[PDB]
Design a protein around this ligand. Sequence first.
Ligand code: NAG
Lengths: 49, 49
Amino acid sequence: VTTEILPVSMTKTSVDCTMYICGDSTECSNLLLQYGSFCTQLNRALTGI
Amino acid sequence: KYNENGTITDAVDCALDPLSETKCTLKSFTVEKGIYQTSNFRVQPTESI
Ligand SMILES: *[C@@H]1O[C@H](CO)[C@@H](O)[C@H](O)[C@H]1NC(C)=O
């Protein structure tokens, strides 16, 4: 009898890109919005994973 | 929502209720069956120390 070990899944990590970059900051968030969808796209990619 | 003639015919109030939040997040007036992440619940400060 032999044992074969294979991974199946990753930890389902999800990162809030706005909180990560501009935590509790209105002034920072307003500047972050000048980058358009970059923040949203990152959240989407992690959701997909 | 702007129609073919450039007239605003509808709108979503992005802070009215949780479904409106989903419609706003997905940039659509139609939401398909499923679970969507739309926001981040945050307790606000009540005192200034
Ligand atoms: C645009 O205007 C024309 C009249 O010139 C009307 O017949 C048509 O239905 C209008 N389009 C929309 C989307 O309301």
